[PDB]
Amino acid sequence: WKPFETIILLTIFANCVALAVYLPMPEDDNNSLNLGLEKLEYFFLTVF
Amino acid sequence: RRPWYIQGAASPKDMLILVDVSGSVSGLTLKLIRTSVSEMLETLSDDDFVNVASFNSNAQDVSCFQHLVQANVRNKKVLKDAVNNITAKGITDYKK
Numbered sequence: 016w017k018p019f020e021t022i023i024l025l026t027i028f029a030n031c032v033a034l035a036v037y038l039p040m041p042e043d044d045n046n047s048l049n050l051g052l053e054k055l056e057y058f059f060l061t062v063f
Numbered sequence: 064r065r066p067w068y069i070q071g072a073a074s075p076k077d078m079l080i081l082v083d084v085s086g087s088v089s090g091l092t093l094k095l096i097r098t099s100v101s102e103m104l105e106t107l108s109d110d111d112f113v114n115v116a117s118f119n120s121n122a123q124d125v126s127c128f129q130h131l132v133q134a135n136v137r138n139k140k141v142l143k144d145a146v147n148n149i150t151a152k153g154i155t156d157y158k159k
């Protein structure tokens with residue numbers, strides 16, 4: 016079916032934003048957003 | 064900042080200095096706090112009380128005191144050797 020262009024293109028483009036606001040912190044520190052998107056990295060792994 | 068100007072412009076103080084020591088403070092912001100704590104303790108007279116408590120994952124007293132000191136000349140010298148050996152890693156919480 017055609018709609019795999021429609022879905023999974025937005026799957027990547029959401030996932031790169033998931034790596035955009037990933038804010039690195041030097042000596043093992045997490046703010047809140049890095050805590051959340053680690054669990055959201057499970058969502059992107061779930062799809063593929 | 065001179066002894067005679069401070070007593071005549073304040074009252075005694077039960078003061079308590081908390082130093083955030085997570086991962087977010089290694090580098091430039093470490094050397095400043097090591098400096099700025101060491102400059103804060105000189106504005107004390109000898110009615111003022113202090114105690115230095117880093118907060119981290121848990122909150123502890125890196126001082127060997129666990130309560131308030133009298134802040135002599137002497138007890139201010141103890142804390143500065145405590146301040147100048149603080150590591151920096153972990154997670155901020157502000158609630159513990």
Ligand SMILES: *[C@@H]1O[C@H](CO)[C@@H](O)[C@H](O)[C@H]1NC(C)=O
Pocket residue numbers: 144145147148
């Ligand atoms: C930190 O340095 C002070 C002063 O030399 C010393 O009393 C203390 O034991 C040191 N702590 C560690 C973990 O090296």
Ligand SMILES: [Ca+2]
Pocket residue numbers: 044085086087155
């Ligand atoms: Ca922090």
